[PDB]
Amino acid sequence: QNAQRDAVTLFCCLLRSRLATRRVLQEYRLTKQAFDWVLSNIEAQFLRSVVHPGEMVGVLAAQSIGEPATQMTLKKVTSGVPRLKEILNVAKNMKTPSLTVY
Amino acid sequence: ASRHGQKGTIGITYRREDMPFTAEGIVPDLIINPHAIPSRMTVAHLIECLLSKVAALSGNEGDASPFTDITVEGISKLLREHGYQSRGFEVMYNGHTGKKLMAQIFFGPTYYQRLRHMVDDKIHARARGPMQVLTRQPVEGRSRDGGLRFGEMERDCMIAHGAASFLKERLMEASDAFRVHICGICGLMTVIAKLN
Amino acid sequence: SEEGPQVKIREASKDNVDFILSNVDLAMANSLRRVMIAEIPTLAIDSVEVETNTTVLADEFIAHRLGLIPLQSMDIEQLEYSRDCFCEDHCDKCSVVLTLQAFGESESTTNVYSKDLVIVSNLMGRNIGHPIIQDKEGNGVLICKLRKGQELKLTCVAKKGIAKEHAKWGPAAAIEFEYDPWNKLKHTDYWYEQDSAKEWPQSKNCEYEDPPNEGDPFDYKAQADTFYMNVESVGSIPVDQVVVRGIDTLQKKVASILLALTQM
Amino acid sequence: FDMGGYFIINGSEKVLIAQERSAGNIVQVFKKAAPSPISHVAEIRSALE
Amino acid sequence: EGLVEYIDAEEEESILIAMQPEDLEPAELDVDPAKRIRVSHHATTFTHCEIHPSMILGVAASIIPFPDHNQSPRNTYQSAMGKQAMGVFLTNYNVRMDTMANILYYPQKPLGTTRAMEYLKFRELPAGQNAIVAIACYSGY
Amino acid sequence: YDRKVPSPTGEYVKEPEWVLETDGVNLSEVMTVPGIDPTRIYTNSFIDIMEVLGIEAGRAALYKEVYNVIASDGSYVNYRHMALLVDVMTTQGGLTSVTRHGFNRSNTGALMRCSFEETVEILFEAGASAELDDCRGVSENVILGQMAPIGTGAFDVMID
Amino acid sequence: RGNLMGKRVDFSARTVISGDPNLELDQVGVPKSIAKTLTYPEVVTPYNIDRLTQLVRNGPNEHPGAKYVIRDSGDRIDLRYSKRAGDIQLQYGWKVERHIMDNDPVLFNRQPSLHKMSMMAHRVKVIPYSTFRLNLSVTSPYNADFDGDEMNLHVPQSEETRAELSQLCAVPLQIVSPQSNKPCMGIVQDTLCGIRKLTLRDTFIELDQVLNMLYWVPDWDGVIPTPAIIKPKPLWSGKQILSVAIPNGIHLQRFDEGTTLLSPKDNGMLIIDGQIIFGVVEKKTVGSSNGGLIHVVTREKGPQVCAKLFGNIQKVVNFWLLHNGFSTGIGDTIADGPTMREITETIAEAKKKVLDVTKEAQANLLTAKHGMTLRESFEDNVVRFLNEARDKAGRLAEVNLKDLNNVKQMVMAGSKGSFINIAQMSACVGQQSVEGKRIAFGFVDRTLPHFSKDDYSPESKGFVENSYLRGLTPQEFFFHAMGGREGLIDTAVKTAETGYIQRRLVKALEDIMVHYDNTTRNSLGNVIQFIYGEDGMDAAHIEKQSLDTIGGSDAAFEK
Amino acid sequence: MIVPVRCFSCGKVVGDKWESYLNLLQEDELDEGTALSRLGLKRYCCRRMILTHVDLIEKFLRYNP
Amino acid sequence: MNAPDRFELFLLGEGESKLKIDPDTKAPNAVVITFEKEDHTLGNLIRAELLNDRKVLFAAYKVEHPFFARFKLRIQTTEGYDPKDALKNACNSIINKLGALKTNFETEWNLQTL
Amino acid sequence: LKEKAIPKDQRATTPYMTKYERARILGTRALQISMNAPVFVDLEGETDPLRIAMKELAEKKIPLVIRRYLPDGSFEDWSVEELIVD
Amino acid sequence: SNTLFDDIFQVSEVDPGRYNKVCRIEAASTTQDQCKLTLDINVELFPVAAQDSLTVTIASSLTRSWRPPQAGDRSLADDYDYVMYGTAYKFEEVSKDLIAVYYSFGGLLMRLEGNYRNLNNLKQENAYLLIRR
Amino acid sequence: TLSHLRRTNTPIGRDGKLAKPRQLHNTHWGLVCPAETPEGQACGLVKNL
RNA sequence: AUCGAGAGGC
Ligand SMILES: [Mg+2]
Ligand SMILES: [Zn+2]
Ligand SMILES: [Zn+2]
Numbered sequence A: 001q002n003a004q005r006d007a008v009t010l011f012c013c014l015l016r017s018r019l020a021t022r023r024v025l026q027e028y029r030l031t032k033q034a035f036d037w038v039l040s041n042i043e044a045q046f047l048r049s050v051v052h053p054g055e056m057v058g059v060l061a062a063q064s065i066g067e068p069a070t071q072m073t074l075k076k077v078t079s080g081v082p083r084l085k086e087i088l089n090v091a092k093n094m095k096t097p098s099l100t101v102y
Numbered sequence B: 001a002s003r004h005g006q007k008g009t010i011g012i013t014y015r016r017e018d019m020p021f022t023a024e025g026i027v028p029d030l031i032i033n034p035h036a037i038p039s040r041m042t043v044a045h046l047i048e049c050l051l052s053k054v055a056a057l058s059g060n061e062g063d064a065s066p067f068t069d070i071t072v073e074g075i076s077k078l079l080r081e082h083g084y085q086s087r088g089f090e091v092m093y094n095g096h097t098g099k100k101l102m103a104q105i106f107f108g109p110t111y112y113q114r115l116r117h118m119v120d121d122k123i124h125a126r127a128r129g130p131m132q133v134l135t136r137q138p139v140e141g142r143s144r145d146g147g148l149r150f151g152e153m154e155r156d157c158m159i160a161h162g163a164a165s166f167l168k169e170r171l172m173e174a175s176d177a178f179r180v181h182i183c184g185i186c187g188l189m190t191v192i193a194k195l196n
Numbered sequence C: 001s002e003e004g005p006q007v008k009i010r011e012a013s014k015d016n017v018d019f020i021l022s023n024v025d026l027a028m029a030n031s032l033r034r035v036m037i038a039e040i041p042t043l044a045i046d047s048v049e050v051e052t053n054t055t056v057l058a059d060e061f062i063a064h065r066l067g068l069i070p071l072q073s074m075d076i077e078q079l080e081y082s083r084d085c086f087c088e089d090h091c092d093k094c095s096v097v098l099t100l101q102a103f104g105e106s107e108s109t110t111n112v113y114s115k116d117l118v119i120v121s122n123l124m125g126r127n128i129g130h131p132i133i134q135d136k137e138g139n140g141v142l143i144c145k146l147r148k149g150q151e152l153k154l155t156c157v158a159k160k161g162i163a164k165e166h167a168k169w170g171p172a173a174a175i176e177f178e179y180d181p182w183n184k185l186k187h188t189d190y191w192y193e194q195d196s197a198k199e200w201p202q203s204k205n206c207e208y209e210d211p212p213n214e215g216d217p218f219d220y221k222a223q224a225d226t227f228y229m230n231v232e233s234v235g236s237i238p239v240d241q242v243v244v245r246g247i248d249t250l251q252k253k254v255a256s257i258l259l260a261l262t263q264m
Numbered sequence D: 001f002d003m004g005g006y007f008i009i010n011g012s013e014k015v016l017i018a019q020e021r022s023a024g025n026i027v028q029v030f031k032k033a034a035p036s037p038i039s040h041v042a043e044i045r046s047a048l049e
Numbered sequence E: 001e002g003l004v005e006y007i008d009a010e011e012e013e014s015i016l017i018a019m020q021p022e023d024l025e026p027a028e029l030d031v032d033p034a035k036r037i038r039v040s041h042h043a044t045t046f047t048h049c050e051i052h053p054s055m056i057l058g059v060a061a062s063i064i065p066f067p068d069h070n071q072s073p074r075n076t077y078q079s080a081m082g083k084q085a086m087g088v089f090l091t092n093y094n095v096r097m098d099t100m101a102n103i104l105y106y107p108q109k110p111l112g113t114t115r116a117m118e119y120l121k122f123r124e125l126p127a128g129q130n131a132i133v134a135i136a137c138y139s140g141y
Numbered sequence F: 001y002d003r004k005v006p007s008p009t010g011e012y013v014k015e016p017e018w019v020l021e022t023d024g025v026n027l028s029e030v031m032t033v034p035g036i037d038p039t040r041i042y043t044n045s046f047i048d049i050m051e052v053l054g055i056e057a058g059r060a061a062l063y064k065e066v067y068n069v070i071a072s073d074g075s076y077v078n079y080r081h082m083a084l085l086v087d088v089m090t091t092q093g094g095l096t097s098v099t100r101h102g103f104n105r106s107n108t109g110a111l112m113r114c115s116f117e118e119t120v121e122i123l124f125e126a127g128a129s130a131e132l133d134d135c136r137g138v139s140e141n142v143i144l145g146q147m148a149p150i151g152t153g154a155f156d157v158m159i160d
Numbered sequence G: 001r002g003n004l005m006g007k008r009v010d011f012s013a014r015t016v017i018s019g020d021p022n023l024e025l026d027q028v029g030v031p032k033s034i035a036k037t038l039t040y041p042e043v044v045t046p047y048n049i050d051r052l053t054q055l056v057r058n059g060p061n062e063h064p065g066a067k068y069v070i071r072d073s074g075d076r077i078d079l080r081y082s083k084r085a086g087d088i089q090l091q092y093g094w095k096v097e098r099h100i101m102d103n104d105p106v107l108f109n110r111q112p113s114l115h116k117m118s119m120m121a122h123r124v125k126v127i128p129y130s131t132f133r134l135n136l137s138v139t140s141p142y143n144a145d146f147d148g149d150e151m152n153l154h155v156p157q158s159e160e161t162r163a164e165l166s167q168l169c170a171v172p173l174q175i176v177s178p179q180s181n182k183p184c185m186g187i188v189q190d191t192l193c194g195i196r197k198l199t200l201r202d203t204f205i206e207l208d209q210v211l212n213m214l215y216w217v218p219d220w221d222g223v224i225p226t227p228a229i230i231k232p233k234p235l236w237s238g239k240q241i242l243s244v245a246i247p248n249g250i251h252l253q254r255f256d257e258g259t260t261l262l263s264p265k266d267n268g269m270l271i272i273d274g275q276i277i278f279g280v281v282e283k284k285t286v287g288s289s290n291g292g293l294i295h296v297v298t299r300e301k302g303p304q305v306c307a308k309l310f311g312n313i314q315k316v317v318n319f320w321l322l323h324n325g326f327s328t329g330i331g332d333t334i335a336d337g338p339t340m341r342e343i344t345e346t347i348a349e350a351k352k353k354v355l356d357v358t359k360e361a362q363a364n365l366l367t368a369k370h371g372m373t374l375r376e377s378f379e380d381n382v383v384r385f386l387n388e389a390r391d392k393a394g395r396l397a398e399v400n401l402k403d404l405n406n407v408k409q410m411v412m413a414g415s416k417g418s419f420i421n422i423a424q425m426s427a428c429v430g431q432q433s434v435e436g437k438r439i440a441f442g443f444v445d446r447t448l449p450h451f452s453k454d455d456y457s458p459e460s461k462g463f464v465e466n467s468y469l470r471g472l473t474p475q476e477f478f479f480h481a482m483g484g485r486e487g488l489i490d491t492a493v494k495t496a497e498t499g500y501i502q503r504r505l506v507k508a509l510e511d512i513m514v515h516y517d518n519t520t521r522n523s524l525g526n527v528i529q530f531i532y533g534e535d536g537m538d539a540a541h542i543e544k545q546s547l548d549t550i551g552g553s554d555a556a557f558e559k
Numbered sequence H: 001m002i003v004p005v006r007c008f009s010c011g012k013v014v015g016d017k018w019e020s021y022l023n024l025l026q027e028d029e030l031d032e033g034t035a036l037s038r039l040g041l042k043r044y045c046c047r048r049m050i051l052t053h054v055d056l057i058e059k060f061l062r063y064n065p
Numbered sequence I: 001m002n003a004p005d006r007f008e009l010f011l012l013g014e015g016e017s018k019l020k021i022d023p024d025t026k027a028p029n030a031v032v033i034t035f036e037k038e039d040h041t042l043g044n045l046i047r048a049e050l051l052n053d054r055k056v057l058f059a060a061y062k063v064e065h066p067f068f069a070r071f072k073l074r075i076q077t078t079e080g081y082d083p084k085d086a087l088k089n090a091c092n093s094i095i096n097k098l099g100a101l102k103t104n105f106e107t108e109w110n111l112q113t114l
Numbered sequence J: 001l002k003e004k005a006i007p008k009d010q011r012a013t014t015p016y017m018t019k020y021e022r023a024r025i026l027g028t029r030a031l032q033i034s035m036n037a038p039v040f041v042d043l044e045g046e047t048d049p050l051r052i053a054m055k056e057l058a059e060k061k062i063p064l065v066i067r068r069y070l071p072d073g074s075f076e077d078w079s080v081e082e083l084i085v086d
Numbered sequence K: 001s002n003t004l005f006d007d008i009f010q011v012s013e014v015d016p017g018r019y020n021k022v023c024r025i026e027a028a029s030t031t032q033d034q035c036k037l038t039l040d041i042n043v044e045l046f047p048v049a050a051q052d053s054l055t056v057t058i059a060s061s062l063t064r065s066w067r068p069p070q071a072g073d074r075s076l077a078d079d080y081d082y083v084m085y086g087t088a089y090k091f092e093e094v095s096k097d098l099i100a101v102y103y104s105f106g107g108l109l110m111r112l113e114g115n116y117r118n119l120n121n122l123k124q125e126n127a128y129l130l131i132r133r
Numbered sequence L: 001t002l003s004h005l006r007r008t009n010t011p012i013g014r015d016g017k018l019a020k021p022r023q024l025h026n027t028h029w030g031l032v033c034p035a036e037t038p039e040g041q042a043c044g045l046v047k048n049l
Numbered sequence M: 001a002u003c004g005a006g007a008g009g010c
């Protein structure tokens, strides 16, 4: 249940921000039935938005990163595909080692 | 293709009736999309179009050689001297309806080339054809009536979709499926089985 | 004259007619020129049986050339479609047989014009299958060239068809077509750099209509009812018959629609 | 219009493609990488003509 | 007669090439705005002059009309595709028994010709046709 | 850098600040210098960060660097995917590379490992160590031509 | 890697592709040859025995036909060479390997398969000609083009396989991709330029065209919308007619720069219940954009409604465009005399600034700014000056472009074309570069043997003040070519490096599956995450919404 | 490789005109523009059929057998 | 290799009726006619003529695929007006105008010299 | 192990039918119907086995049961009847 | 089914914008210096000069598929010169008892402000605009 | 045929990320065609005179 | 079947 509250924390922040009493009654003008309808739709859309078990999210991640890297095209730092190759292959001898000091 | 990397295939064939036409009655042999123009910046294609128009009207040659003092402005002066719009545009009427196109159209002679790639020489299809000898997999190649490769780069996508049974079929029922007998003690296919 | 559409011929020739179509809606003129292009029937070679070919061209090259040759089709209506007739392959009521045999006799190069075609089959007295010849020197279209020692022996069978099946059956070519030289209809938006007027050439048909007043507002309810056409014929059918037969073919299509409605 | 410049081996026409190499008997000087124990090198590729 | 010379890559290190013989005319304004911008050479100690700059191109590139108005990758693409266009590859095609041959029925010489086409014999063995092209949106096909 | 920070009134406002950009990395030393903020300093050498600030800092800087290589090209990939990549590189002890020398050395079966690179050597090492492949990996079943435990084959189906 | 992890397979086909504006999104144009070549095993049941007998009697040589029949005994029966190919007695439980027919599920693919959206289920439409045909709006997920690309088709062989295609790999499902949490398909070039032109406030349509468009929308209610203008002539607006494609129940609100609710330049977009109120429709509205129209209609209405939406928008806009017309020409690359003059005067002022900074560097009067050499300072300054000149001339050009300029229109719609394309084609093509620097001294202390030694002039090191319209001088030509070569090499090399990287990513994370307890694990069960994405949501149906709590004065927050 | 019968674009027969064209160039020593005009070839669709033509057949004839 | 025989552009086959007629759904007094082996030449003219009959509410045609020679014409008329009668009247008006065109043209051509 | 079941009350897996198990179930039923197996719905003019299975689903007359497996080996049996479809 | 607003306005500022057949015209009420409006007008059909005075009217009638005027029998509700049909999308509460309404006639917009039309212009899809010369 | 007869190969590598040998070099002016070269792999290695 | 070369799409 702690993990549950943690997972839903941020979306609940958005919820309370949007379903704030003075907002519901002054910014929107929701009626009773309209409010309960918003509630049911929210819960339904949430439950539908949950990820489905069985999803092979690993291949999905790999493809979702590799595809836009195939369109990675051409002012001081190694960027793009050379940088990505430096990152994945753990590159101890990187070409633009920098340090940003605040 | 044309002589400027503007390559492409034929999508449709229209008879002269359905083709758009100018008041002179002239009809395009070819129709290419304006959207292939600005992304490649192949201005020479359009200059060629303009020059070829003025040459065909003049019965002279088109000095499309590079590093010359031939300008678009002089070409246009000539073309207008021949009674056409200087930038090469022409009012054109729809072929289906015959109402003027609200847009005037760039339209003229341009050298095009027929490339060595043709569909009936690329087309292939196979369903349970010849198999290879060693792997017992489909043979490689159209000229041998083989099967396309279901590469692992595609097995990846089939996994990301989640289609387990389609993947097994592509891997067993559509290629080199086989059945062997194995011993419940030594887990190796060394069993001699008279099925008859 | 007859109440309805109005015609006024500006110029007329054996090969082309420049006229005006008044009190007509656009769709009619457009379907008329579409029919004038595709739906009107003529006669042209649709089969070739080749016996000897020592020429530098392949057989199919020559066959494609022959199909394109203009043949007389004035009386084509009295000839029937081979698909419609009852013969085995072709007859005299459905097809015309030409023959072409020439030999490279002379040391100099020997041409083969369309005039060298010989009509074998029985015409049964109709203006049909005559290779069209408008050349000043009487020769036809240059079909092939022969060296001393080459010959060519073949038999063409001309049938009846329309340009839809193949463009060889096209009775006309290059139908000029314009309406509203002044764009009073606001049917096209002129692309320009400085002045659309000075940057677009005036149409020749601007003379036959009065220019508008710059202060007069847009005549919005006016529609297009006057057309400037110029129909040119290769010669397989005279221009007058090209346009009249197109009119009648259009009418015949509408008629078939009527009859099918009745059968329903 | 034939231009020649090809051979005819067993019916098939063959072309000899120009093979590109660096010229020998010329002296070139090349720096060495940072982790190299030696600093520079002078090389000449002595070839008997 | 000493009017022309053979210069290789090494020797041209020691020379100053002019581009057009007009670069040797003296100078002592009202110009055509449409022509390209050619900088004054500002050099005088010339030893040679290019025969014609268009000669920096290969056989294939000398087919491209106005390659000075194109993104160079397009010129490269075309130089790779011009070797795939059909046409009369030889006048004796009917005699040669080649594994594959493709001949254009009615080849046309282009209406836009490079001066270098004459020495390439392209107007005598063309590989395309002057198609009437319309750039237009029409049915979206 | 024109960074944003809350005004005392509460609304965010742009407050620029001077920042130092170097041409080299020794984090353990630069960190302990006076006059700096030892809580906001940053490196593109995420491996030095794993060395100094622990493994989770490494995860965070790793994700940040991948995010930047994507967003440099104006593109955008959702958080979860880069997250999964970074976590996989970090879920082990420390930084595991996506190479034959990194991930391919784990105990993740034997047929799955041989399917990437160095195939016959993996198979020899397994035949020596008497490895027992679980046959629960994807590539194991793909090789065996069976329905792998994937979204559709992630369970059984039976009768009521 | 060549016979186990991937192999050649039966029931496959491959050929060229072209596009059909009259095909559905999930539809795929299958040539009749291939349909006669590929088979599906269908079992005989009371529901099919009539159709299956008809197909067997129809024969393998003409479609819809069948090729083989499989009895209970298990002996194959070849319909090409058999006495009894006419009098067939189909018994229940037999198998007819029927032809591929309309609305069959096929897997459609284009290599390189970088995507789940690169292998997608399609509905079969058997077509006459020899090319594969697909909807324009399905190109972007495949990265396909009609310049010679070829595509592959695989055919399922069991009912569960067809089910896995239709219910998981179908096209409308994969509209919103989990990658980038947005739609991967949108309205594209022709339809895009046309939908812009149509939805202009200046665009009115007469009755006849209106009725033809109305009928063109398939799932049309059959109710003519009340015209916008009535009195002098009953007229509709391009907006009004296009709104018939949008399903009722759709709200879309978006504000651009200076988007008053009066929107004097038709900015933004306001669409109320399948009818639009104001806003020119363009790429931002109807592209494959986050929070676009496709995002909405897929989330609210669903996948199939959005696929029909693709179809209807395309059909209406393509009709209107076909009867409207569009072209490019070179006249859309000419700026007028005064603009060209200002452009060349700008190039001259940039040349003067470069000359001045060069002379200053020559007199050793440079300030050695920390961290960089004198030469590095010099090169940075001159490159900056020339880029500023190119950009200023390009904006000088784009200002002079009129609204009728079709290049400007394609840019405005977002169909194709960018500012830099305009700048280079008409204003100035720019500075050429190799390995990040200007044209290097390949010869001894010069770039070309037409230059005096030690000439750091703008053009001597690769600056092209001439435009593609004007024409490049031979040195400019050679330098441009020198840069383009680097470009082609970088492309050809990035391709292979990305292929390797992608393969390694996939082979590393392949076994990562979200299990039933939401724990993201691998083959060994070793946990990689405890909540997928740390919130356990699918990457699709996730949208960029604002958090009104952050930001704003505490005063306004309290208020 | 030989004069096409008619223009591809419009269809006006041109095959009957080749030998005239050449003679209009050689007999009358005209230029190709006026020569094409004299033959009723006004549309440029027609004009390019003759102007861009290459009678390769004259080479093919030179091969003896 | 896959091209259809060109005669299929005008040549009906295997009981393909020229006209097929279907009542429209959710449309009072409306009907859709599927013309077979015809193109814009006919449909454009029939529709533009139906637009002149003041008792026609709706009239439009469409070619669902240029591959095929066929098209769809939907007509909605007033109550008590079988649209087939509107189609007939339009067609007959077409034919009358065409006959008058032919006669006037022949008049002008025989009047014309050369 | 030996009877590693889970009591039907203390079940924490999703009560909703995942798209993957839905597609697998529909495919299994369409397979059963491809062969002559009985159909438990009044097919209102439906022939395609897939649509028949989908309608058997909407009326929840599909007598199958999913066995969701947990990485420890524990599993939960879920009738198609109780599983929610959305 | 009758009129919901009536007034006479004097043309103040007409601007073409980047369009060629449409202008955006801002006008104010006559004899009343407190109520004003802006509106998109097709100038090709109905021209609008500066400082004109055009009678402006809004009606709610005079769902069902549109049909053209069959004959003169159709009794128009419009002896005016320029008529349009649109939808109200916003009612702007400008100030205390100062209201404004936003209309869209297929993209041609309208903004109207005042408070002598309050009791009439409801949130109705139904809306007709009429202009007498 | 001509382009094939004026082709040069540079065998220093078949597969590798070699940018320097491939790029168009200043010295190639007038001797090698700047643009005519294969696409993709072996770009800039195979040249035409 | 092995090896080699050329080409297509990114
Ligand atoms: Mg491509
Ligand atoms: Zn044993
Ligand atoms: Zn007969």
Ligand SMILES: [Zn+2]
Pocket: H007, H008, H009, H010, H011, H012, H043, H044, H045, H046, H047
């Ligand atoms: Zn012509």
